[PDB]
Amino acid sequence: TELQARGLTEKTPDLSDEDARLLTQRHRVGKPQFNRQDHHKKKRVSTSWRKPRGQLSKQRRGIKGKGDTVEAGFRSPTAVRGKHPSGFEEVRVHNVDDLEGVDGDTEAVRIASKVGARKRERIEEEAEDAGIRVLNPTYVEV
């Protein structure tokens, strides 16, 4: 009658108090957009980031208000870096074989988008039976 996602969409990993504090930190602090200088002033200039090289550039010079310049002090904590917001580490999956070795508590799975409906169904279920969650599940009517 209604649509319901296959799999363990509610499953949550188990993280050591530290990693949970760290994950929580990242989510709290966040980071600046880090978009290219003046991208919003000229259409031809895309949002993608390029270091400002102008000798007189206001950003390059760090004038307050002209945007944060990309630098290492902005990195996320080692422990959680790359972690999906749920806390899960992801594993790119293309076929059923790829599901082997994946710990359903530590990692969730993302099925390459290129995979077709047929091969998905196989994966989606076998994945669940292995205790693994699939971040991008098929929604069926039940």
Partner RNA sequence: UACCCUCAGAAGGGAGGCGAAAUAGAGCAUGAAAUCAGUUGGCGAUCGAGCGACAGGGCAUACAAGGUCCCUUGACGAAUGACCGAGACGCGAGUCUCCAGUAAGACUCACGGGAAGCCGAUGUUCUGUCGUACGUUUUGAAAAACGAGCCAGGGAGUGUGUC
Partner RNA sequence: GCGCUCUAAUUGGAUGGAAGCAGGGGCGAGAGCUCCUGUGGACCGAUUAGUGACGAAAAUCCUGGCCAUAGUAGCAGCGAU
Point out which residues bind Mg ion (CB under 5 A): 39, 43, 45
Six token digits for residue 120: 């998905």
Quick one: what does residue 101 bind among RNA, Mg ion, Cl ion, none, with the CB cut-off 5 to 8 Å set by partner type? Answer: none
Q: Are 37 and 66 in contact (CB under 8 A)?
A: yes
Q: What are phi and psi of 140, to 5 degrees?
A: -115, 170
Instruction: Name the binder of 65 from Cl ion, Mg ion, RNA, none, CB < 5-8 A by kind.
Output: RNA
Distance in angstroms (rounded) separating the CA atoms of residues 93 and 86: 18
CB closer to RNA, 70 vs 103: 70
By a kind-dependent CB cut-off of 5 to 8 A, residue 130 interacts, out of Cl ion, Mg ion, RNA, none, with none
Our CA dihedral for 127, 133, 75, 17, rounded to 10 degrees, sits at: -120
In a 10 Å sphere around its CB, with 0-12 CB exposed, 13-18 middle and 19+ buried, how is residue 69 labelled?
Answer: middle
Residues 10-39 that bind Cl ion (CB under 5 A): 21
Site for RNA in 36-95 (CB under 7 A): 37-38, 40-46, 48-50, 52-60, 63-68, 70-72, 74-76, 80-86, 92, 94-95
From the list 11, 35, 91, 106, which residue makes contact with RNA (rule: CB under 7 A)?
A: 35
User: Please, where are the H alpha helices in 1-142?
Assistant: 17-29, 117-129
> Taking CB positions, which residue lies at the least distance from Mg ion?
43
Binding site for Cl ion (CB under 5 A): 21
